[PDB]
Design a protein around this ligand. Structure first.
Ligand SMILES: *[C@@H]1O[C@H](CO)[C@@H](O[C@@H]2O[C@H](CO)[C@@H](O)[C@H](O)[C@H]2NC(C)=O)[C@H](O)[C@H]1NC(C)=O
Ligand SMILES: *[C@@H]1O[C@H](CO)[C@@H](O)[C@H](O)[C@H]1NC(C)=O
Ligand SMILES: *[C@@H]1O[C@H](CO)[C@@H](O)[C@H](O)[C@H]1NC(C)=O
Ligand SMILES: *[C@@H]1O[C@H](CO)[C@@H](O)[C@H](O)[C@H]1NC(C)=O
Ligand SMILES: *[C@@H]1O[C@H](CO)[C@@H](O)[C@H](O)[C@H]1NC(C)=O
Ligand SMILES: *[C@@H]1O[C@H](CO)[C@@H](O)[C@H](O)[C@H]1NC(C)=O
Ligand SMILES: *[C@@H]1O[C@H](CO)[C@@H](O)[C@H](O)[C@H]1NC(C)=O
Ligand SMILES: *[C@@H]1O[C@H](CO)[C@@H](O)[C@H](O)[C@H]1NC(C)=O
Ligand SMILES: *[C@@H]1O[C@H](CO)[C@@H](O)[C@H](O)[C@H]1NC(C)=O
Lengths: 1008, 49
């Protein structure tokens, strides 16, 4: 009764001696699965355990009792056996064979055995401690890995991780499927084709390894090749609904299958007058051939009787006649004689079966039958398909015959005698022959082919009259014309099929399809999973069915909140409300209902001035992948074979250099749109608008300010690409010069503002620049001129929040980070296609040439190099489209700098959410960062409105800013900041009379 | 009508009966022909009389 415990994270070993540093290189090989049952053994009162794909052995031998192993497949004193001895701190291995007893064991009562040998082939000799020894045989090599870790615990395995470095290689080369140890707690495991995501540290030591198919988070980590999985929903893999068993349907029975009618014929014709009953246009059940107990012979020539039913014949035949018993063995191809020539000739390529059975007790007469006659002799063989009903008189000699016997006149007609005194060879027999023909015509007769049963609403294979496929059959109300058999859709895809047996219309539907998403919060917060099966009914696969698919692990919430991890079709998940993953119907913001009014307004009395951050990827990794070196590695044969493609090699580089020069152009019109590099004044008297965060720090080595430094640190794999011809050309503008241009643009924004875009810079105080950047958004400059210090407070507070956004949030620079990524794995996969076989024997040109002769090696590198060229074409097209996106973003950034840095953009939602003020470019690698200072009202107050005022009967409309009242007196204020005016003629213009205006109220106008 | 043809060794015959009362010429209208008998003889026939 073995006990079963949890293995924790045990069973991870260095697969190979290659050294890796700080890389999460995943691998798949014969491994011990995580959290598997372990069969604990002990020595009370020693069987053979299966070797399986691999063997894991662990023991705790304080006194070193467990030191031996006996391995093998038969152990019949004929096969070599592994034998390990650890005596005097010496490892001894030998494969000698000795005879075994009834109970072979080692003298171990409470605290060795070896006889002579037969065949020996391989000789080799070299609690407190837990010793681990995995056993496996890969490529004929027996491998042992060891790891001794000092712990103080004996009840169970520790909850930790430790690697298993190897010791020796044993090249036995002999297949092993069994083993048996020889003897105080030791475990036994089993290795299975699993897959891990190893993690090597700086020094190359495996600090942690995770399985792939353990749990949904394990699969997410295995797919992402990372341990820290952030928030969101990740598409891991797909899932199929397998067909249940099968469905095969064919027409059957039809009318009668009248083979028995031929069988039970009362009378039979003569041998010369064999009758052919044509068999066609009838489903052949072939049930008569089964009862062979009453049939004397059952054989087929030129056809396999087993495959008679599985194959369909265009036409079939059956022939019946009566001959003598001993003639059965003469009906065979390649046989001659009078019977084989003048009666029936069998061609060597005859295709059919010959069947006969006893009929002596029914077709024999006491006086003898006188009804079956034929022609005894003829000059030659009968021509094919001839009915030999001729009764010509035989005349061997030259003497003519007058129809009467005489001199050399022998009557060719003789009669047979059927008598009881005759032997077995005179018995009458019934013979029936079947011939099946396959001419140049489509098949018309098919077997029943096991019509079986038909199942609805369960995914299964189907075979309807030769129409195969997979799906689920459902009842449908689509009418079919009698000649129309099966349906169709617009895309030439089968939709409805009618059962041949019953004229019922059945749909055909996909089984499940859909991927396997994994909705998990980040490991920073939780560890629980929630699998979404995309677009499947929750019947084949707690469970809360959604429109987007079948969702598992989250309970529906009747309440609606803000979306955090979008799922699909309005469903959103979250871990917070113990707390667990949920899935509800998304509610976009609090459902508001602004009280739309006849004459009432809510004009803000206060506001806020945020500084958002929209990052735009302006440039990218300038790459010019030379075609020859990258595609062909140092081979004259490859160079000659690549020259055939011609313009592809020489034009890929042209396209990539066009990309490079256009990226430099993007950088030029993005940053280098300033003619003169302006420099910051030594004294920064901005009236509290602190700029040291984004103005370059002289104490810094480069003129990159604190914000730019934080951005560069946040964005990150540096010198691991430019290694296979992917020559990352340096930018024409040095990163220091990029910083210089950004600082020049920002300093021009400070001192000159928008003017330095229309010629030389023209000085203007920063207090004056916002004094009109408020005026751009329809906000009077009195706002700043009265609360400039507060404006500075909000500005610096938002700048302070910028560092927090960079540090605490990994998605603050999402766009630039993912652009640098996209480039990184673009070049990375470009590298991996050098390892892809692409249909070739291998990915090493030198290996191909060394292995095989050039006549076939040339074709091998031809296919490989076509694959590599296609991969490079795909990369360059993806690069062109991505660079088109980057160019759109670069023109967008140039527009934002011209209208928004070099001006004040009036396009809403272009320079951030709200009334925009200015922007500051802060370059980050392969991109740029803007600091969109915007204006956002916060606090409102409900007032009363009216379009016009009639004091002396003349209407009065506001020039800018609707009429408002505080309850007693009426005032004028702009839209975006409450600031009352005394209603005078200066801010009003008369237009028309009073009764034409809707919503006008009487009011009093001051007279200046 | 009797359509005669050996297409891919598959002899098809279609038909469509429409009760009309006119003898002047062929009708000015549309009709559809559905198959009745289909014997895949496959014979190498290229002429008829
Ligand atoms: C608009 O709101 C700001 C706060 O966001 C107000 O600033 C406050 O001003 C008072 C003095 O009037 C100070 O005592 C407070 O400390 C300020 N707030 C903060 C957070 O420091 C401002 O007064 C408001 N303006 C109007 C017209 O109400
Ligand atoms: C790697 O070895 C060095 C020895 O100088 C040690 O300082 C360092 O901590 C080791 N790395 C890790 C991850 O332990
Ligand atoms: C992420 O981890 C840090 C580390 O303490 C923590 O401060 C932060 O709150 C975590 N993120 C969230 C969203 O809670
Ligand atoms: C799932 O199948 C049931 C029948 O088993 C059906 O009633 C239900 O409508 C299906 N679900 C959806 C979303 O169609
Ligand atoms: C501006 O901010 C920096 C750091 O944020 C600080 O060292 C400096 O004293 C500030 N200057 C003013 C005038 O507040
Ligand atoms: C205006 O707002 C106040 C405070 O919410 C409210 O009491 C009052 O009823 C509102 N008046 C109108 C006309 O909505
Ligand atoms: C509206 O403002 C005027 C300004 O003189 C003041 O006299 C009056 O009391 C105010 N009324 C309300 C309801 O605030
Ligand atoms: C809206 O206000 C105008 C003011 O002149 C008034 O004439 C009209 O009756 C009001 N309508 C409603 C529906 O309150
Ligand atoms: C506004 O005042 C005029 C006085 O000239 C009067 O005739 C008119 O009826 C008044 N309308 C309202 C809505 O009070």
């Amino acid at each position: 009764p073995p006990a079963y415990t949890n293995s924790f994270t045990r069973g991870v070993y260095y697969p190979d001696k290659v050294f890796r540093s700080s890389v999460l290189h995943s691998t798949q090989d014969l491994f011990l699965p995580f959290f598997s049952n372990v069969t604990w053994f002990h020595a009370i009162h020693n069987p053979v355990l299966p070797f399986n794909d691999g063997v894991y052995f662990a023991s705790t031998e304080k006194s070193n009792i467990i030191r031996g192993w006996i391995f093998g497949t038969t152990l019949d004193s004929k096969t070599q056996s592994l034998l390990i001895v650890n005596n005097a701190t010496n490892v001894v291995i030998k494969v000698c064979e000795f005879q075994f007893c009834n109970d072979p064991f080692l003298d171990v009562y409470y605290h060795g055995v070896y006889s002579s040998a037969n065949n020996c082939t391989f000789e080799y000799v070299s609690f407190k401690n837990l010793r681990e020894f995995v056993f496996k045989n890969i490529d004929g090599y027996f491998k042992i890995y060891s790891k001794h870790t000092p712990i103080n615990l004996v009840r169970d395995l520790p909850q930790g991780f430790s690697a298993l470095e190897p010791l020796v290689d044993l090249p036995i080369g002999i297949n092993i499927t069994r083993f048996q140890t020889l003897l105080a707690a030791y475990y036994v495991g089993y290795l299975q084709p699993r897959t891990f995501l190893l993690k090597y540290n700086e020094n190359g030591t495996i600090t942690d390894a995770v399985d792939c198919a353990l749990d949904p988070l394990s699969e997410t980590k295995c797919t992402l090749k990372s341990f820290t999985v952030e928030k969101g929903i990740y598409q891991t893999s797909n899932f199929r609904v397998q067909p249940t068993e099968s469905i095969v349907r064919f027409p059957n029975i039809t009318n009668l299958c009248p083979f028995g009618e031929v069988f039970n014929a009362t009378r039979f014709a003569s041998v010369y007058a064999w009758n052919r009953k044509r068999i066609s246009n009838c489903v052949a059940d072939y049930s008569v051939l089964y009862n062979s107990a009453s049939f004397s012979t059952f054989k087929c020539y030129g056809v396999s009787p087993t495959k008679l039913n599985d194959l369909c014949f265009t036409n079939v035949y059956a022939d019946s006649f009566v001959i003598r018993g001993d003639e059965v063995r003469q009906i065979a191809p390649g046989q001659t004689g009078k019977i084989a020539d003048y009666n029936y000739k069998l061609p060597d390529d005859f295709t059919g079966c010959v069947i006969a059975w006893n009929s002596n007790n029914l077709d024999s007469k006491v006086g003898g039958n006188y009804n079956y006659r034929y022609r005894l002799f003829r000059k030659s063989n009968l021509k094919p398909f001839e009915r030999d009903i001729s009764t010509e008189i035989y005349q061997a000699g030259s003497k003519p015959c007058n129809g009467v016997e005489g001199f050399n006149c022998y009557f060719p007609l003789q009669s047979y005698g059927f008598q009881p005194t005759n032997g077995v060879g005179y018995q009458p027999y019934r013979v029936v022959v079947l011939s099946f023909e396959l001419l140049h015509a489509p098949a018309t007769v098919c077997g029943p082919k096991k019509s079986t049963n038909l199942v609805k609403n369960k995914c299964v294979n189907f075979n309807f009259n030769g129409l195969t496929g997979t799906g689920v059959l459902t009842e449908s109300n689509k009418k079919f014309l009698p000649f129309q058999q099966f349906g169709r859709d617009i895309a030439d895809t089968t939709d409805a099929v009618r059962d041949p047996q019953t004229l019922e219309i059945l749909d055909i539907t996909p089984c499940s399809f859909g991927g396997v998403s994994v909705i998990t919060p980040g490991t920073n917060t939780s560890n629980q999973v929630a699998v979404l099966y995309q677009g499947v009914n929750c019947t084949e696969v707690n469970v809360f069915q959604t429109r987007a698919g079948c969702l598992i692990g989250a309970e529906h919430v009747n309440n609606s909140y803000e979306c955090d991890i979008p799922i699909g079709a309005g469903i959103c998940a979250s871990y917070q409300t113990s707390q667990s993953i949920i899935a509800y119907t998304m509610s976009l913001g609090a459902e508001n209902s602004v009280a739309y009014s006849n004459n009432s307004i809510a004009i803000p009395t206060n506001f806020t001035i945020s500084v958002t951050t929209e990052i735009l990827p302006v440039s990218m990794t300038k790459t010019s992948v030379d075609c020859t070196m990258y595609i062909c590695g140092d081979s004259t044969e490859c160079s000659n074979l690549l020259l055939q493609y011609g313009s592809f090699c020489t034009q890929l580089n042209r396209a990539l250099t066009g990309i490079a020069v256009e990226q430099d152009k993007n950088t030029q019109e993005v940053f280098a749109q300033v003619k003169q590099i302006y420099k910051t004044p030594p004294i920064k008297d901005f009236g509290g608008f602190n700029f040291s965060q984004i103005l370059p720090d002289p104490s810094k080595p480069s003129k990159r300010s604190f914000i730019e430094d934080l951005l560069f640190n946040k964005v990150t794999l540096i010198c691991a690409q430019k290694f296979n011809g992917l020559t990352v050309l340096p930018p024409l503008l040095t990163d220091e010069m990029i910083a210089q241009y950004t600082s020049a643009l920002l300093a021009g924004t400070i001192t000159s503002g928008w003017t330095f875009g229309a010629g030389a810079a023209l000085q203007i105080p920063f207090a004056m620049q916002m004094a009109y950047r408020f005026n751009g958004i329809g906000v009077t400059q009195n706002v700043l001129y009265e609360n400039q210090k507060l404006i500075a407070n909000q500005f610096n507070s938002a700048i302070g929040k910028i560092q927090d956004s960079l540090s605490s949030t990994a998605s603050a620079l999402g766009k630039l980070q993912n652009v640098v990524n996209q480039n990184a794995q673009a070049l990375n996969t470009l590298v991996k296609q050098l390892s892809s076989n692409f249909g070739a024997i291998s990915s090493v040109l030198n290996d191909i040439l060394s292995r095989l002769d050039p006549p076939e090696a040339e074709v091998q590198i031809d296919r490989l190099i076509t694959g590599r060229l296609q991969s490079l074409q795909t990369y360059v097209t993806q690069q062109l489209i991505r660079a088109a996106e980057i160019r759109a973003s670069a023109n967008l950034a140039a527009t934002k700098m011209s209208e928004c840095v070099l001006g004040q953009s009036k396009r809403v939602d272009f320079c951030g959410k709200g009334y925009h003020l200015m922007s500051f470019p802060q370059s980050a690698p392969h991109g740029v960062v803007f600091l969109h200072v915007t204006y956002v009202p916060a606090q409102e107050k409900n007032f009363t409105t009216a379009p016009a005022i009639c004091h002396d009967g003349k209407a009065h409309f506001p020039r800018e800013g609707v009429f408002v009242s505080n309850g007693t007196h009426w005032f004028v204020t702009q839209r975006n900041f409450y600031e009352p005016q005394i209603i005078t003629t200066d801010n009003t213009f008369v237009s028309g009379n009073c009764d034409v205006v809707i919503g006008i109220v009487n009011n009093t106008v001051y007279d200046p």
